[PDB]
Amino acid sequence: HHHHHKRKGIILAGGSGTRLHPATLAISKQLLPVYDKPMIYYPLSTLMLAGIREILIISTPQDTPRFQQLLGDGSNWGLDLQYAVQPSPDGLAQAFLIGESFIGNDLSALVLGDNLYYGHDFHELLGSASQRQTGASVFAYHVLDPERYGVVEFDQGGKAISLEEKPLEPKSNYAVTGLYFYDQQVVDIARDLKPSPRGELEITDVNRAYLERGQLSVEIMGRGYAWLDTGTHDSLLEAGQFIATLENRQGLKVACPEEIAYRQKWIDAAQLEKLAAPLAKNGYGQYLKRLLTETVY
Amino acid sequence: HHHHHKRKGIILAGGSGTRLHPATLAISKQLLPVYDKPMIYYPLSTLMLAGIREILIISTPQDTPRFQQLLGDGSNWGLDLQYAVQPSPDGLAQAFLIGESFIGNDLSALVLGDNLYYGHDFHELLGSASQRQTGASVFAYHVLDPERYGVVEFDQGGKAISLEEKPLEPKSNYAVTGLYFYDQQVVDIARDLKPSPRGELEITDVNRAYLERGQLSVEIMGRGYAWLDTGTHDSLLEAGQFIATLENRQGLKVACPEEIAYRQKWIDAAQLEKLAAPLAKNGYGQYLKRLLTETVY
Amino acid sequence: MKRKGIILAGGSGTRLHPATLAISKQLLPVYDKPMIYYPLSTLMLAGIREILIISTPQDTPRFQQLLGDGSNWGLDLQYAVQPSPDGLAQAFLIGESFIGNDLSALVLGDNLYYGHDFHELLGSASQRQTGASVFAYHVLDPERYGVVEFDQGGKAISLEEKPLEPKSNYAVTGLYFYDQQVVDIARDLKPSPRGELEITDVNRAYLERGQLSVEIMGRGYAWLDTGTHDSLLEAGQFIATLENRQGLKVACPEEIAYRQKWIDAAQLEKLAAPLAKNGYGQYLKRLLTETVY
Amino acid sequence: MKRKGIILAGGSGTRLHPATLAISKQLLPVYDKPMIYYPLSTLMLAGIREILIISTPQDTPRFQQLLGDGSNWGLDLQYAVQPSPDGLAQAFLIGESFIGNDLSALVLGDNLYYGHDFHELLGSASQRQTGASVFAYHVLDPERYGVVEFDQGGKAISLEEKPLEPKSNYAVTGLYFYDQQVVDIARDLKPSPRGELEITDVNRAYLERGQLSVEIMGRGYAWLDTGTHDSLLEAGQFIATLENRQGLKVACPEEIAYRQKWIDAAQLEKLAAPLAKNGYGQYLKRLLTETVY
Ligand SMILES: Nc1c(NS(=O)(=O)c2ccccc2)c(=O)[nH]c(=O)n1Cc1ccccc1
Ligand SMILES: Nc1c(NS(=O)(=O)c2ccccc2)c(=O)[nH]c(=O)n1Cc1ccccc1
Ligand SMILES: Nc1c(NS(=O)(=O)c2ccccc2)c(=O)[nH]c(=O)n1Cc1ccccc1
Ligand SMILES: Nc1c(NS(=O)(=O)c2ccccc2)c(=O)[nH]c(=O)n1Cc1ccccc1
Ligand SMILES: [Cl-]
Ligand SMILES: [Cl-]
Ligand SMILES: [Cl-]
């Protein structure tokens, strides 16, 4: 007998094959900085914004130690970070089999370690997904090139009616973004997946399984949000310029984990002050210091 | 006797002195494009988002005809556009004396013709300002360099308690943005202003007058909004790159007046189709065409 | 012998509308200065002081207002209009009386160049008293341009304007040096199938006689693209990154006039006054007392 | 006589942290390729095939993994470590046995160069069998660098490292050519007040004997800044704008090896295979059948 009487995060950061070689020969894409910080800070900060404190980072065997050196066990930021390896890039849905013991009987959320988001009320957008305990929640976002993505088709009433992975003739311009919230059904659904035509375990098949059960919520992520492309060297550069323009204008940083932990009340002023000390001689540490004596609405 | 029984817009687009010379020797700043469209499209689109259909464009004598050629009388976009000249750059609050006959007994809103905004729920942010019929509404936005702006000081409860124009030691990092909503008190307040130390009629003195009457609402424009700097050649370039990254990612345009009029139901599908015809051979006209047969949430 | 310059700054049509609905592309700035400063600076660097600016009927007065007669910068500027965009070769019909019996050079008003020894690359073109000189430059999209084909020995053997199947990746740049033959060649041109008097036909005229020098503008040079919104932006970011790293401006005509000895220390000082309170005037004042090699 | 190359790719400290917390700056890409490809390409362009790469203890194995022994690219690469950032002059102590009795050249691992005839600017430096050659370049912020002062006749008369009051806007670039004297000069260096064995002291050693050639790297050259987050970004956008306009890559070592005749058509074909499905491999295959001037 079980007794009745929260949600766990996973970041998939398993590199990018040979696609961005030779730039990425020496290091994983998700460790490349976007402007002033490692790329993985952005998706990590996204889970943190969602209220998620227990997080599994999945990376290659080769680069797990570098992620561990960067991020540690999470204790500096009021988190618990665990690590797992992905020996072979067999697809996104593999995160649930690799993370099966990590997930246990809890709800979960998956984010791609190369996905950057920005916008107003993002916290509330994520909170509504997080609070849907049952079913799956995903986000749809209008893009120029939906053929590159999982694409969501809507009826005249706005109801999601189909999902297609990289269709040659997209039914809409609405791509499914790399942020996914799941209930306790996901690991079993994932265990029963067959590899696609490309020998790959597809997240879109998972989401379609939920859709078929009538348990997929598709929330629109509106045009006033920025979901930044990191798929090409060109988009990477644009991502960096975007973040720089925002931060240099505002004097506020996007996806600074120290700050988000501090505003979530996972760390206090004294602990924030300690995290500042080692980087006091650069703008990043000076930024952390300033946050101790400024009200930011 | 009067009988009881809406809001009018003004765009101040009077160039920028010799500050950006020689770039601006041949044309007004507010006619320079930001990426794919004239700069003035952005603030105009902002008033339109606010529901404002009756709009006065104030510019130099020299460049009024170029604005008129670009924008016409507004009828193509379901607007009414009127024009006035500013012979001498005597300051922002002068818009109310120049626009006194235009404003009549109505509520009003002023936007700077070089101010660009972007973000999620911007429509709702503007709608709440617009619906406050009484008093004045402005927006405060965290910036790196508040000393360049009107700066708003808040007490521990978040109440605005003072305003200072370009203080050497800012009380906060919260700048007052170039978007202002006013009731019928503004023209009289403006008529009674004395020129500042720089022989200039200050908008901050207007706003302070409302603050002193207890009739200033300061709404925070949060960090997830982008209020883009156009004060320098460097910021202008960043503004252009920002818009380009957003539009090329999304396949949706920022501050396309044809689109906003169409979504506000100020023009119909047949009229939108006609506006598309003359630019059918470029991406702008092709964009307008696509909007006729796509649902965009 | 004298060589006169022509800048063609005509219309880009509706192709960049609405950004260019109010004013022509070449009057807009690239970063910190009007686009036209860059081609003008190019001719000045080539040692050319007598220059005809050709633009649309609507915008010629505004070019006249921006640049004047040139005497502030040691130049002798004149102006003319191209009523319709009927081809680049039309520059020599419009500018026939301006050219007279002199050598000539044509630059396109939206073309930006940069690199080391640009002065000497131009000087060597300017020095050829006979024939015509053009520059070929490797580009990813040669189909947009006049395309030069070379034999195995490096010799130019053909030119095709916007070929559907380009013979090489070498584009002819928007800078052309001609001898006294070009007017008579241009006045015999017939309109092409797309309806224009083609500069590539003028160039093929010289090529058929062995009198077209096609010099390679190497990859260490920047010929920046201004044909799209995207490329206009890249040009702004390119000039800004160079200028902010070096503290030296690209295509500042006051500076170029001063280094050519066309204006003196005193005259550059007067030019610095009006913009003393901004970066451009500050730059020009610094030129008075800094040795730049 | 043989000239050997050294690339110093040491630590930037905590100054770019956290972006560089996980891995050193010079292993990160600039646009499409690892930063270190650019300085390596610079030495290769200078005709140097025997090259010692010096990095931090933690990252040397990763440079070893990226570049191998060099034989795929017609190079002979070796590796060594700088345990602590105790000065650029330390390169010659670490690399003493590597250098032996040969001429040498040092490039900083985070320095990017671009422009026309860069090959000939380097070649002329390489050809000087005696003394030392450096390059001076006008910058807005000379206080960050080794600063060269010139008399009215153009002669270098002093060097100051990071002066509070710089004597000119001319910075010494991160590229240095030395004769057989440099090791013996470096082994006599004492640490400066900031605690480093200074390359500027090595250069002043040559200057005191009339044996420092200070050549001007002109404004038509790009020496890009990689010292800040802002400048790293500008470098990426600068390389991208050049490469996308031209269809030609800056500092592709496979290409440079191929043009130097250090690898043949067959060997470049093998190098193209692994990345055939992306832009880099496609670029390299195209080099086999395209004449680029
Ligand atoms: N809004 C925000 C953002 N902006 S965001 O919502 O667009 C964002 C958060 C996390 C990752 C990427 C973007 C941020 O980077 N850092 C923050 O500290 N905040 C403030 C914040 C932090 C925590 C809870 C609610 C609000
Ligand atoms: N949201 C939006 C935007 N984005 S915005 O709110 O950030 C904005 C609007 C106007 C000017 C600048 C930004 C836009 O450019 N064009 C649009 O058509 N829209 C959609 C829209 C149009 C009209 C009413 C409500 C929503
Ligand atoms: N080289 C240079 C340049 N650089 S350039 O040759 O790449 C260039 C010249 C003109 C237009 C665009 C670029 C410049 O902007 N302004 C300058 O004063 N010079 C210096 C100069 C001036 C006059 C003669 C020879 C060299
Ligand atoms: N010029 C050039 C360049 N341009 S460069 O001289 O500005 C340069 C070389 C090396 C590193 C950075 C820039 C290049 O990237 N790759 C090349 O193959 N070349 C051509 C080349 C190759 C070998 C010898 C002489 C010229
Ligand atoms: Cl939205
Ligand atoms: Cl916000
Ligand atoms: Cl070259």
Ligand SMILES: [Cl-]
């Ligand atoms: Cl030069």
